[PDB]
Coordinates of C-alpha atoms in Angstrom, one line a residue:
Chain A
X1262 CA -4.8 -59.4 -29.9
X1263 CA -2.6 -60.7 -32.3
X1264 CA -3.0 -58.2 -35.7
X1265 CA -1.3 -59.5 -38.6
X1266 CA 1.2 -57.4 -40.6
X1267 CA 2.1 -57.1 -44.2
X1268 CA 4.7 -54.2 -44.6
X1269 CA 7.5 -56.3 -43.2
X1270 CA 6.9 -59.2 -45.5
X1271 CA 10.0 -58.1 -47.8
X1272 CA 12.6 -58.6 -45.2
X1273 CA 11.4 -62.1 -45.5
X1274 CA 10.7 -62.9 -49.1
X1275 CA 14.3 -61.3 -50.3
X1276 CA 16.5 -64.2 -48.4
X1277 CA 13.8 -66.9 -49.1
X1278 CA 12.6 -67.4 -45.1
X1279 CA 10.0 -69.4 -43.4
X1280 CA 9.9 -67.4 -40.2
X1281 CA 7.5 -65.3 -38.2
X1282 CA 8.4 -61.8 -36.2
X1283 CA 5.9 -60.9 -32.8
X1284 CA 6.4 -57.1 -32.6
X1285 CA 4.3 -55.6 -29.4
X1286 CA 4.7 -51.7 -28.1
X1287 CA 4.3 -51.6 -24.7
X1288 CA 2.5 -54.3 -23.8
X1289 CA 1.9 -58.1 -24.7
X1290 CA -2.3 -56.6 -25.2
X1291 CA -1.8 -55.6 -28.9
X1292 CA 1.3 -57.3 -31.1
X1293 CA 1.8 -57.1 -34.5
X1294 CA 3.0 -59.8 -36.7
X1295 CA 3.4 -61.3 -40.3
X1296 CA 2.1 -64.9 -40.0
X1297 CA -1.3 -65.1 -37.5
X1298 CA -0.5 -68.9 -37.6
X1299 CA 2.8 -68.7 -37.0
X1300 CA 3.3 -66.4 -34.1
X1301 CA 1.4 -69.0 -31.7
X1302 CA 3.6 -72.0 -33.1
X1303 CA 5.3 -73.8 -31.0
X1304 CA 8.8 -74.1 -31.1
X1305 CA 11.9 -75.9 -29.3
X1306 CA 13.2 -73.1 -27.7
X1307 CA 17.2 -74.0 -27.8
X1308 CA 19.1 -71.7 -25.7
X1309 CA 16.6 -69.5 -25.5
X1310 CA 15.5 -71.7 -22.1
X1311 CA 18.8 -70.0 -20.1
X1312 CA 16.5 -67.1 -19.5
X1313 CA 13.9 -69.1 -17.3
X1314 CA 16.7 -71.2 -16.0
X1315 CA 19.3 -68.5 -14.8
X1316 CA 16.0 -67.0 -12.9
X1317 CA 15.5 -70.7 -11.5
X1318 CA 19.0 -71.2 -11.0
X1319 CA 18.9 -68.1 -9.0
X1320 CA 16.1 -68.4 -7.2
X1321 CA 16.6 -72.2 -5.9
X1322 CA 19.6 -71.2 -4.5
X1323 CA 21.5 -73.4 -7.5
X1324 CA 23.3 -70.0 -8.2
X1325 CA 24.7 -68.5 -5.6
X1326 CA 24.4 -65.0 -6.9
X1327 CA 24.8 -62.3 -9.0
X1328 CA 28.8 -63.1 -8.8
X1329 CA 28.7 -66.8 -9.4
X1330 CA 31.8 -68.3 -11.7
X1331 CA 30.8 -71.2 -14.1
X1332 CA 34.3 -72.7 -12.8
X1333 CA 36.0 -75.1 -16.4
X1334 CA 36.5 -78.3 -15.3
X1335 CA 39.4 -78.9 -17.8
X1336 CA 37.1 -81.6 -20.2
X1337 CA 36.3 -80.8 -23.4
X1338 CA 33.4 -79.1 -24.6
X1339 CA 31.6 -78.8 -27.7
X1340 CA 32.5 -75.2 -28.5
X1341 CA 35.8 -73.4 -27.8
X1342 CA 34.5 -70.1 -26.4
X1343 CA 32.9 -72.6 -23.7
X1344 CA 36.2 -74.3 -22.6
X1345 CA 37.0 -71.3 -19.6
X1346 CA 35.6 -69.7 -16.8
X1347 CA 32.2 -67.8 -16.9
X1348 CA 29.8 -65.4 -15.3
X1349 CA 26.0 -65.7 -15.4
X1350 CA 26.3 -63.1 -18.5
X1351 CA 29.7 -65.0 -20.4
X1352 CA 27.9 -68.1 -19.9
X1353 CA 24.6 -66.5 -21.1
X1354 CA 26.4 -65.2 -24.0
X1355 CA 28.5 -67.3 -25.2
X1356 CA 24.8 -69.9 -25.0
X1357 CA 27.7 -72.2 -22.6
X1358 CA 25.1 -75.2 -23.2
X1359 CA 27.1 -77.0 -20.6
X1360 CA 27.3 -74.4 -17.9
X1361 CA 23.4 -74.1 -18.0
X1362 CA 22.4 -78.4 -18.7
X1363 CA 24.4 -78.5 -15.2
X1364 CA 22.4 -76.0 -13.4
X1365 CA 19.4 -77.9 -14.4
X1366 CA 20.5 -81.2 -13.2
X1367 CA 21.2 -79.6 -9.6
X1368 CA 17.8 -78.0 -10.4
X1369 CA 16.3 -81.4 -10.9
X1370 CA 13.5 -82.5 -12.5
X1371 CA 10.6 -81.2 -9.7
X1372 CA 11.4 -78.2 -9.4
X1373 CA 12.2 -77.5 -13.3
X1374 CA 8.7 -78.5 -13.6
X1375 CA 7.2 -76.3 -10.6
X1376 CA 8.8 -72.8 -12.2
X1377 CA 7.7 -73.7 -15.6
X1378 CA 4.0 -73.7 -14.8
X1379 CA 4.5 -70.6 -12.9
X1380 CA 5.7 -69.0 -15.9
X1381 CA 3.6 -70.7 -18.2
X1382 CA 6.5 -71.3 -19.6
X1383 CA 5.4 -73.3 -23.7
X1384 CA 3.5 -76.6 -23.3
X1385 CA 5.5 -76.8 -20.3
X1386 CA 7.2 -80.8 -21.6
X1387 CA 10.0 -81.3 -19.7
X1388 CA 10.4 -85.0 -20.4
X1389 CA 12.8 -87.4 -21.4
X1390 CA 16.3 -85.9 -19.6
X1391 CA 16.7 -83.2 -17.5
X1392 CA 19.5 -81.9 -19.8
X1393 CA 18.2 -82.0 -22.9
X1394 CA 14.3 -81.1 -22.5
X1395 CA 15.6 -77.7 -24.0
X1396 CA 17.8 -78.2 -27.5
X1397 CA 16.0 -82.1 -28.7
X1398 CA 13.4 -83.2 -26.3
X1399 CA 9.6 -81.6 -26.5
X1400 CA 9.6 -78.5 -25.0
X1401 CA 8.2 -76.1 -27.5
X1402 CA 7.0 -72.2 -26.9
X1403 CA 6.1 -69.9 -29.2
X1404 CA 7.5 -66.5 -30.5
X1405 CA 4.1 -64.8 -28.9
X1406 CA 4.4 -67.1 -25.3
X1407 CA 8.3 -65.9 -25.1
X1408 CA 7.0 -61.8 -25.7
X1409 CA 4.4 -62.7 -22.5
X1410 CA 7.4 -64.3 -20.7
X1411 CA 10.0 -61.6 -21.6
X1412 CA 7.1 -58.6 -21.0
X1413 CA 7.3 -60.8 -17.3
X1414 CA 10.5 -60.4 -16.6
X1415 CA 11.0 -56.9 -18.0
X1416 CA 7.5 -55.6 -15.1
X1417 CA 9.1 -58.1 -12.5
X1418 CA 6.3 -60.0 -12.5
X1419 CA 7.3 -63.1 -12.4
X1420 CA 7.4 -66.1 -9.3
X1421 CA 10.6 -65.0 -8.8
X1422 CA 12.4 -62.1 -6.5
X1423 CA 12.9 -58.5 -8.1
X1424 CA 17.0 -59.3 -7.2
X1425 CA 17.1 -62.4 -9.5
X1426 CA 15.2 -60.9 -12.2
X1427 CA 17.1 -57.6 -12.2
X1428 CA 20.1 -60.2 -11.9
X1429 CA 19.3 -62.1 -15.3
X1430 CA 18.0 -58.7 -16.9
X1431 CA 21.4 -57.2 -16.8
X1432 CA 22.9 -60.4 -18.2
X1433 CA 20.8 -60.1 -21.0
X1434 CA 22.2 -56.7 -22.2
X1435 CA 23.3 -57.0 -26.2
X1436 CA 23.2 -53.8 -26.9
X1437 CA 23.4 -50.6 -25.2
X1438 CA 23.3 -47.0 -26.7
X1439 CA 22.0 -43.9 -25.7
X1440 CA 19.3 -43.1 -27.6
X1441 CA 18.0 -47.0 -26.9
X1442 CA 19.0 -50.2 -24.5
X1443 CA 18.5 -54.1 -26.1
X1444 CA 18.0 -56.8 -24.1
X1445 CA 18.0 -59.9 -26.7
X1446 CA 18.6 -63.7 -26.6
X1447 CA 19.2 -66.3 -29.5
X1448 CA 18.8 -70.2 -29.7
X1449 CA 19.5 -72.3 -32.5
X1450 CA 18.0 -76.1 -32.1
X1451 CA 20.1 -77.1 -35.3
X1452 CA 20.3 -77.9 -38.7
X1453 CA 17.5 -80.6 -38.2
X1454 CA 16.7 -84.0 -40.4
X1455 CA 15.3 -84.7 -43.3
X1456 CA 12.5 -82.6 -44.5
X1457 CA 12.5 -81.6 -40.7
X1458 CA 14.2 -78.5 -40.1
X1459 CA 15.5 -77.5 -37.1
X1460 CA 14.6 -73.4 -35.8
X1461 CA 16.4 -70.4 -34.5
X1462 CA 15.2 -68.1 -32.8
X1463 CA 16.5 -64.1 -31.7
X1464 CA 14.2 -63.0 -28.6
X1465 CA 14.1 -60.1 -26.7
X1466 CA 12.8 -56.0 -25.9
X1467 CA 13.8 -52.5 -26.7
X1468 CA 13.5 -49.6 -24.6
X1469 CA 13.8 -46.3 -26.8
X1470 CA 13.1 -43.6 -25.1
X1471 CA 10.2 -44.2 -22.8
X1472 CA 8.5 -46.4 -24.6
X1473 CA 9.0 -50.8 -24.6
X1474 CA 9.2 -52.7 -27.4
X1475 CA 9.2 -57.0 -26.8
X1476 CA 10.4 -59.0 -30.2
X1477 CA 10.4 -62.5 -30.9
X1478 CA 11.6 -63.8 -33.8
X1479 CA 11.7 -67.7 -35.6
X1480 CA 12.4 -69.8 -38.7
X1481 CA 13.2 -72.4 -40.0
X1482 CA 16.3 -73.3 -41.0
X1483 CA 18.1 -76.1 -42.7
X1484 CA 22.2 -74.7 -43.3
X1485 CA 24.3 -73.0 -40.3
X1486 CA 24.8 -70.3 -43.4
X1487 CA 21.6 -68.8 -42.4
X1488 CA 22.0 -68.1 -39.2
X1489 CA 22.8 -64.5 -39.0
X1490 CA 19.3 -63.9 -40.5
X1491 CA 17.9 -64.4 -36.8
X1492 CA 18.7 -61.0 -36.2
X1493 CA 19.2 -59.5 -39.0
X1494 CA 15.3 -59.6 -40.7
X1495 CA 14.4 -58.5 -37.2
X1496 CA 16.8 -55.3 -36.7
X1497 CA 15.5 -54.2 -40.6
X1498 CA 12.6 -54.9 -39.3
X1499 CA 12.3 -52.9 -36.2
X1500 CA 15.6 -49.8 -38.1
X1501 CA 12.5 -49.2 -40.4
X1502 CA 9.7 -49.0 -37.8
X1503 CA 12.0 -46.3 -35.5
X1504 CA 13.0 -48.2 -32.8
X1505 CA 16.3 -49.6 -33.1
Chain B
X50 CA 41.3 -51.2 -2.6
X51 CA 44.4 -53.5 -1.7
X52 CA 47.3 -51.0 -3.9
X53 CA 48.5 -48.7 -5.9
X54 CA 51.2 -48.7 -8.3
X55 CA 52.7 -45.3 -10.3
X56 CA 52.8 -46.2 -14.1
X57 CA 54.1 -43.5 -16.5
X58 CA 54.2 -45.4 -19.5
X59 CA 50.2 -44.0 -19.9
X60 CA 51.4 -40.7 -20.0
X61 CA 51.4 -41.3 -24.2
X62 CA 47.4 -40.6 -24.0
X63 CA 47.7 -37.8 -22.1
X64 CA 51.2 -35.9 -23.7
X65 CA 49.6 -36.4 -27.5
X66 CA 47.0 -34.2 -26.2
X67 CA 48.7 -31.7 -24.0
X68 CA 46.5 -33.2 -20.8
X69 CA 46.7 -32.6 -17.5
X70 CA 45.1 -34.7 -15.8
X71 CA 44.8 -38.7 -14.7
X72 CA 43.8 -42.4 -15.3
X73 CA 43.0 -44.7 -12.0
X74 CA 42.6 -48.6 -13.0
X75 CA 42.7 -51.3 -10.3
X76 CA 41.8 -55.2 -10.9
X77 CA 39.3 -56.7 -9.0
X78 CA 40.6 -60.6 -8.4
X79 CA 44.1 -58.9 -7.7
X80 CA 42.9 -56.0 -5.6
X81 CA 45.9 -53.1 -7.5
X82 CA 45.4 -50.9 -8.7
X83 CA 47.7 -48.7 -11.8
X84 CA 47.8 -45.2 -12.0
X85 CA 49.9 -42.6 -14.0
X86 CA 49.4 -39.8 -11.4
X87 CA 49.3 -41.1 -7.9
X88 CA 49.7 -37.4 -6.7
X89 CA 46.1 -36.2 -8.5
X90 CA 45.2 -39.6 -8.3
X91 CA 44.4 -38.3 -4.4
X92 CA 43.0 -34.8 -5.2
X93 CA 39.9 -33.7 -4.8
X94 CA 37.5 -32.2 -7.1
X95 CA 33.4 -31.4 -7.7
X96 CA 31.8 -34.7 -9.0
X97 CA 29.4 -32.9 -10.9
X98 CA 27.0 -35.5 -13.2
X99 CA 29.1 -38.6 -11.7
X100 CA 27.0 -37.7 -8.6
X101 CA 24.2 -38.7 -10.4
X102 CA 25.3 -42.2 -9.3
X103 CA 25.1 -42.0 -6.1
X104 CA 22.1 -39.6 -5.5
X105 CA 20.2 -41.7 -8.0
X106 CA 21.3 -44.4 -5.0
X107 CA 19.6 -42.3 -2.2
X108 CA 17.0 -41.3 -4.5
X109 CA 15.5 -45.2 -5.3
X110 CA 16.8 -45.7 -1.1
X111 CA 15.1 -42.8 0.2
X112 CA 11.5 -44.2 -1.6
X113 CA 12.1 -40.3 -3.7
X114 CA 12.7 -42.7 -7.0
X115 CA 9.5 -44.9 -6.9
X116 CA 10.9 -47.5 -8.7
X117 CA 13.1 -48.5 -12.7
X118 CA 10.5 -47.9 -14.7
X119 CA 10.0 -44.5 -13.3
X120 CA 9.7 -41.4 -15.9
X121 CA 10.3 -37.6 -14.7
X122 CA 8.0 -36.1 -16.3
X123 CA 9.2 -32.6 -18.3
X124 CA 6.6 -30.1 -17.4
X125 CA 7.3 -27.5 -20.3
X126 CA 9.1 -24.5 -18.7
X127 CA 12.5 -24.5 -20.6
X128 CA 15.6 -26.1 -19.2
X129 CA 19.9 -25.8 -20.4
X130 CA 19.7 -28.1 -23.1
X131 CA 17.3 -29.4 -25.6
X132 CA 18.2 -33.0 -24.5
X133 CA 16.8 -32.5 -21.7
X134 CA 13.1 -31.2 -22.4
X135 CA 11.4 -34.8 -22.8
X136 CA 10.0 -37.0 -20.6
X137 CA 12.5 -40.2 -19.8
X138 CA 13.3 -42.7 -17.3
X139 CA 16.1 -43.3 -15.1
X140 CA 19.1 -44.7 -17.1
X141 CA 18.1 -41.7 -20.0
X142 CA 18.9 -38.7 -17.2
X143 CA 21.4 -40.6 -16.5
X144 CA 22.5 -40.6 -19.6
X145 CA 22.0 -37.1 -20.3
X146 CA 22.9 -36.3 -17.8
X147 CA 19.8 -34.2 -17.2
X148 CA 20.5 -32.1 -14.3
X149 CA 17.1 -30.3 -12.9
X150 CA 16.1 -34.1 -13.0
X151 CA 18.1 -35.0 -10.3
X152 CA 18.2 -30.7 -9.3
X153 CA 14.6 -31.6 -8.1
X154 CA 15.7 -35.4 -6.2
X155 CA 18.1 -34.2 -4.2
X156 CA 15.7 -31.2 -2.9
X157 CA 12.7 -34.2 -2.2
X158 CA 16.1 -36.2 -0.5
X159 CA 16.9 -33.9 1.0
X160 CA 19.9 -32.4 3.4
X161 CA 19.6 -35.1 6.5
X162 CA 19.4 -37.6 4.7
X163 CA 21.8 -36.8 1.5
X164 CA 24.7 -36.7 4.3
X165 CA 23.9 -39.7 6.0
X166 CA 23.7 -41.6 3.0
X167 CA 26.6 -39.9 1.7
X168 CA 28.0 -40.4 5.0
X169 CA 27.4 -44.3 4.8
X170 CA 29.2 -44.3 0.7
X171 CA 32.2 -42.5 2.2
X172 CA 31.5 -40.2 -0.7
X173 CA 34.7 -37.9 -0.7
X174 CA 34.9 -34.8 1.7
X175 CA 31.3 -35.1 2.2
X176 CA 30.4 -31.3 1.8
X177 CA 26.9 -30.9 0.8
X178 CA 27.4 -27.1 1.6
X179 CA 26.3 -24.4 -1.8
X180 CA 22.7 -24.9 -1.9
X181 CA 21.6 -28.0 -1.6
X182 CA 20.7 -28.7 -6.0
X183 CA 23.5 -26.9 -6.7
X184 CA 26.6 -28.9 -3.8
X185 CA 28.7 -30.9 -6.5
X186 CA 28.0 -28.8 -10.0
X187 CA 29.9 -25.5 -8.5
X188 CA 29.4 -26.2 -4.7
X189 CA 31.8 -27.6 -1.7
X190 CA 30.9 -31.7 -2.6
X191 CA 35.0 -33.2 -3.7
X192 CA 35.8 -36.6 -4.7
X193 CA 39.1 -37.9 -6.2
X194 CA 40.0 -40.7 -8.7
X195 CA 41.3 -43.0 -5.5
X196 CA 37.2 -42.7 -4.0
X197 CA 35.6 -43.7 -7.2
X198 CA 36.9 -46.5 -7.9
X199 CA 36.0 -47.7 -4.1
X200 CA 32.6 -46.1 -4.3
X201 CA 32.5 -47.7 -7.8
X202 CA 33.7 -50.9 -6.5
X203 CA 30.9 -51.1 -3.3
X204 CA 28.4 -50.8 -6.0
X205 CA 29.3 -53.2 -8.1
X206 CA 29.9 -56.5 -5.0
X207 CA 26.5 -54.4 -3.5
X208 CA 27.8 -53.7 -0.8
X209 CA 26.7 -50.0 -0.1
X210 CA 24.7 -49.1 2.9
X211 CA 21.6 -49.4 0.0
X212 CA 18.9 -52.7 -1.2
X213 CA 21.2 -55.2 -3.8
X214 CA 17.7 -53.8 -5.4
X215 CA 18.9 -50.7 -5.8
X216 CA 22.2 -50.6 -6.6
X217 CA 21.3 -53.3 -9.3
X218 CA 18.6 -51.4 -10.9
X219 CA 21.2 -47.9 -10.6
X220 CA 23.7 -50.3 -11.7
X221 CA 21.3 -51.6 -15.2
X222 CA 21.0 -47.6 -15.4
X223 CA 25.0 -46.8 -16.0
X224 CA 25.0 -49.9 -18.6
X225 CA 27.4 -47.8 -21.7
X226 CA 28.4 -50.7 -24.0
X227 CA 28.1 -54.2 -24.3
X228 CA 29.8 -56.8 -26.1
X229 CA 29.6 -60.7 -25.6
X230 CA 33.3 -60.5 -24.2
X231 CA 33.3 -57.3 -21.7
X232 CA 30.0 -55.2 -20.6
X233 CA 30.6 -51.8 -19.4
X234 CA 29.3 -49.6 -16.6
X235 CA 30.1 -46.0 -17.2
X236 CA 29.5 -41.6 -16.2
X237 CA 31.0 -38.9 -17.3
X238 CA 31.1 -35.6 -15.5
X239 CA 31.3 -31.7 -16.4
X240 CA 31.8 -28.6 -13.8
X241 CA 32.4 -26.4 -16.6
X242 CA 35.0 -24.6 -18.1
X243 CA 36.2 -23.2 -15.2
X244 CA 37.5 -19.8 -14.3
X245 CA 41.1 -18.2 -15.0
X246 CA 43.9 -20.2 -14.1
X247 CA 41.7 -22.6 -12.9
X248 CA 39.9 -24.4 -15.1
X249 CA 37.2 -26.7 -14.7
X250 CA 37.1 -31.1 -14.4
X251 CA 35.8 -33.3 -16.7
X252 CA 35.3 -37.5 -15.2
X253 CA 34.8 -40.4 -17.3
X254 CA 34.3 -43.2 -13.6
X255 CA 32.6 -46.6 -14.0
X256 CA 34.0 -50.4 -14.6
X257 CA 34.7 -53.2 -16.9
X258 CA 33.2 -56.5 -16.8
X259 CA 35.8 -59.0 -19.2
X260 CA 35.7 -62.7 -18.8
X261 CA 35.6 -63.4 -15.0
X262 CA 37.9 -60.3 -14.3
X263 CA 36.4 -56.9 -13.7
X264 CA 38.0 -53.5 -13.9
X265 CA 37.3 -50.3 -12.2
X266 CA 38.4 -46.5 -13.5
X267 CA 38.3 -43.4 -13.1
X268 CA 39.6 -40.6 -15.3
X269 CA 39.4 -36.7 -14.7
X270 CA 41.5 -33.9 -16.3
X271 CA 41.6 -30.0 -16.4
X272 CA 39.3 -28.5 -18.4
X273 CA 39.2 -25.0 -20.1
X274 CA 37.3 -25.6 -23.6
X275 CA 34.0 -27.6 -24.2
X276 CA 36.3 -28.6 -27.8
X277 CA 38.1 -31.6 -25.6
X278 CA 35.1 -32.2 -23.6
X279 CA 36.0 -35.7 -25.6
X280 CA 39.3 -36.9 -24.5
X281 CA 37.7 -37.9 -21.2
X282 CA 36.6 -40.0 -23.5
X283 CA 39.1 -41.4 -25.6
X284 CA 42.1 -41.1 -23.6
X285 CA 41.4 -44.0 -21.3
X286 CA 39.6 -45.7 -23.4
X287 CA 42.8 -46.0 -25.5
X288 CA 44.3 -47.0 -21.6
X289 CA 42.2 -49.7 -22.0
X290 CA 42.1 -51.3 -25.7
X291 CA 46.2 -51.2 -25.1
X292 CA 45.4 -52.7 -21.5
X293 CA 43.4 -55.8 -23.5
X294 CA 40.7 -54.8 -21.3
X295 CA 38.7 -52.7 -23.9
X296 CA 38.4 -53.8 -28.5

């Protein structure tokens, strides 16, 4: 059950943004959204794929454990901030593409398909290159499926050890306050091409009091200056609803 | 740990607020600790709420706490603070230091099993006498700054005699600050304003993960006035800020 909420629209309006926010209190059994259609429209996950990729890397032994260090070989990487040794949480927090590319290479095409099926992750389309299917390939997922996936992670209900789900959940903490706790991940496919904008994501969940709220946001983007909106629009919404 | 050295430079932060206290700061990779006060670093004090860490571990291990989604229901009988008069999750009771909630866990764990796990954990003097619901706030259990950092290091490394899963559950409960460059796990303690000439004790213990490095810390200080409480965080914060660890 997905119910439309019109009282969030001003936040999209005021910024000239074409996007969707999906928010579910307690569970995915009833979610609210500004856009029914777009709530279930499927986009490239970009770095939001680091969540399932991380779980898969741990499950298959490719990530040896919680304290694994991803050593930099000194070879040039696309961002200076990726040019250093990284923990799992460090690599997730700065979206070190090349670290997770190498994890996917070692997981390999057969095992990757296996887990995306168990995880019911989007269209499960990993075709066209093991190291880029989530960035520029054919894998697609929706705000709704993102929320369903994150809830399973929250409840340890994914087909993976409790231990590995706990390990990944700690790597996803992005805000801690006495009153609430935020787990979240960003994604950004790029600026897109001729009349085909990229997509930007912010997905996660917020624990406040004895309550839980799972959220997923996406938006079309053709200009990187617009990227802070991926967090400020939904943050606005969750501030007014009284979640954070 | 592997070594300790006394670094009296940090005294600046203490003298400022005229605090009698100790900060212990350990670097994981090099296995070395630094402190302003070697003597006080080994002195043993009431854990107070810092004991909520092992108690949480024990509580989950014994099954007294079902899992991490367990809610500790507030009945309705008055409690010592308004904060504690509500339903809390494990992280909630930890973050607000809800004494009654952990008192209840302690009783359900019981003395034999509590004695056993603290033996396993090498937690301070291991004296749980003076009740079973106050042995850490006003009883006989005492722990040193050095012992805290070793304990906390074992937790981080999942090396405590409890399931890795249970240690992960507690560890997530201890997150108090998250930044893209560093993560702080920590817990406070406060035994009370104490008596005449013998003041109470305030704690701040935890660790910081920054880059591929990890920093285990333990702070305590003498305290006779609740107004001074916030110094339990601001002194070590400034030490670790000036060490370049946080900020």
